[PDB]
A paper describes a structure:
By screening of scaffolds which met requirements as therapeutic proteins, we selected serine protease inhibitor Kazal-type 2 (SPINK2) as a protein scaffold, followed by constructing an engineered SPINK2 library. SPINK2 comprises a constrained region containing disulfide bonds, and a flexible loop region. Using a series of phage display screening experiments and a diverse engineered SPINK2 library, we succeeded in acquiring quite specific inhibitors for every target protease tested with sub-nanomolar Ki values and picomolar KD values. Further, generation of a crystal structure provided insights into the mechanism underlying the high affinity specific binding of those inhibitors for their target molecules, suggesting that the engineered SPINK2 inhibitors preferentially bind to the groove of target proteases via the engineered flexible loop, supported by its constrained structure.
In addition, the KLK4/8 dual inhibitor, K41043 had IC50 values of 2.1 and 14 nM for KLK4 and KLK8, respectively. The randomized region of K41043 directed to the catalytic pocket of KLK4, and K41043 residue Asn23 formed a hydrogen bond with the catalytic His71 of KLK4. The S1 pocket of KLK4 was deeply buried by K41043 residue Arg24, forming a salt bridge and hydrogen bonds. In addition, K41043 formed a 310-helix at the randomized region of the crystal structure, whereas this was not observed in the wild-type SPINK2. In contrast, there were conformational differences between wild-type SPINK2 and K41043, which were primarily observed the in randomized region; the maximum distance between them was 11.4 Å (Cαs). There were few conformational differences in KLK4 with or without K41043; the root-mean-square deviation value between them was 0.346 Å from 190 Cαs. The binding loop of K41043 was entirely buried in this large area, providing a high level of conformational complementarity, and there were no water molecules within 7 Å of the catalytic His71 of KLK4. In the KLK4–K41043 co-crystal structure, there were no water molecules within 7 Å from the catalytic His71 of KLK4. This may be because binding of K41043 to KLK4 excluded the water molecules essential for protease turnover, hence K41043 acted as an inhibitor, but not as a substrate. It revealed that 25 residues of KLK4 within 4 Å from K41043 were located not only in the S1 pocket, including the catalytic residues (His71 and Ser207), but also in a surface distant from the S1 pocket. In the KLK4–K41043 structure, the entire interaction surface area was 863.3 Å2, and included salt bridges, hydrogen bonds, and hydrophobic contacts.
Author numbering:
A (entry chain A): 31 to 253
B (entry chain C): 12 to 66
Write the structure that this text describes.
C-alpha cells in the first residue's frame, strides 16, 4: 500500500494473509466463515492463511488463527482475455469461529460509482519499496470506465475497474493482490494489477470488479 | 533469463513473487522486472529467485 498508514489494529477483520515459506505473497478476504475470496493469480494447490492478524506474527496477535485450505476454484474465464476475471474462491478446511478480530464482509451487488472514496488494505510494498510491519490502509477514489479503458487499452475488460491515480500517489502495490477494496462498507473489489512503479501520478490501480460475479460467487458457495 | 513475451507491457499482477536482478535490485515479480527492462532500455538478468542477498 503506497502512501497509506497503519490500519487501526483489527479494523479490517475480513483480511486474510496468504503466506508460504513464511513470506506473504497475496491477501484474501474472508466472505463466509468457510470461504476466502482472492485474485485467481494468487492460486496455489494448498494454502496457509492467517486470520485476525495485524503484524504477520501470529504468536503476538491474540485471537489470530492460521488456518488451512486445500480447495480452491478459479473463475472459469480467468486470464481470458489477459488479466481478466481475476478472482477465485478458497474453501477453508474448517469454518472459522468469528470474533471481534475475524469476521466476514458482504460483497457489493452494485457496480462501482465513479467518484466514490473506497478503502484498500494490505501488507504489500510501501512507497519506499520496504515491507510494513502491520496492515496498511489507504483511501482511493474510483475513476470512470472511460478513464480505465484509455489508460489500460487494450487490456481493459468489464471484469475490471480502476481506482486511484490521484496526484497524492495513493495506490495498492505488489503484495496487495487479492486484498479488499471497500466502498461504503461492502466489498467492491480485489486488488488485481497495475503498472510499475505503483502510485504513479495519473495512473489508477486495477481491481477485480466483483459486481459482475455475484451469480458465480453465490452458485459456488451455495453448492 | 526473463521471458518478457509471457507478460503484458500494459500491466503486472500485484502478487509478491520476488526476483533478484543482475542490477542488484530485487523486483516484486518477474513481470515488474520486465517493465523495468522496457522503461530503462537495458536487459536485466535474473541472478536468482527471491530477494537479492546483501554482500
Amino acid at each position: 500500500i503506497i502512501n497509506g498508514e497503519d490500519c487501526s489494529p483489527h479494523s479490517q477483520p475480513w483480511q486474510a494473509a496468504l503466506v508460504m515459506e513464511n513470506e506473504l505473497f497475496c491477501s484474501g478476504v474472508l466472505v463466509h466463515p468457510q470461504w476466502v475470496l482472492s485474485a485467481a493469480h494468487c492460486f496455489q494447490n494448498s494454502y496457509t492463511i492467517g486470520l485476525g492478524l495485524h503484524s504477520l506474527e501470529a504468536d503476538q496477535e491474540p485471537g489470530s488463527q492460521m488456518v488451512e485450505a486445500s480447495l480452491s476454484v478459479r473463475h472459469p474465464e480467468y486470464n481470458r482475455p489477459l488479466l481478466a476475471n481475476d478472482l477465485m474462491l478458497i474453501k477453508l478446511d474448517e469454518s472459522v469461529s468469528e470474533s471481534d478480530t475475524i469476521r466476514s464482509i458482504s460483497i457489493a451487488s452494485q457496480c462501482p460509482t465513479a467518484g466514490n472514496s473506497c478503502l484498500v488494505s494490505g501488507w504489500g510494498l510501501l512507497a519506499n519499496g520496504r515491507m510494513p510491519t502491520v496492515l496498511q490502509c489507504v483511501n482511493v477514489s474510483v475513476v470512470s470506465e472511460e478513464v480505465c479503458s484509455k489508460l489500460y487499452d487494450p487490456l481493459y475488460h468489464p471484469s475490471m475497474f480502476c481506482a486511484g491515480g490521484g496526484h497524492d500517489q495513493k495506490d495498492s502495490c505488489n503484495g496487495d493482490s487479492g486484498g479488499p477494496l471497500i466502498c461504503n462498507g461492502y466489498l467492491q473489489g480485489l486488488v488485481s494489477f497495475g503498472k510499475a512503479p505503483c502510485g504513479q501520478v495519473g495512473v489508477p490501480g486495477v481491481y477485480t470488479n466483483l459486481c459482475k460475479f455475484t451469480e458465480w460467487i453465490e452458485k459456488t458457495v451455495q453448492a | 533469463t526473463p521471458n518478457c513475451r509471457r507478460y503484458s507491457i500494459h500491466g503486472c499482477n500485484r502478487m509478491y513473487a520476488p526476483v533478484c536482478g543482475s542490477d542488484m535490485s530485487t523486483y516484486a515479480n518477474e513481470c515488474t522486472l520486465c517493465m523495468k527492462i522496457r522503461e530503462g532500455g537495458h536487459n536485466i538478468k535474473i541472478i536468482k529467485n527471491g530477494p537479492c542477498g546483501a554482500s
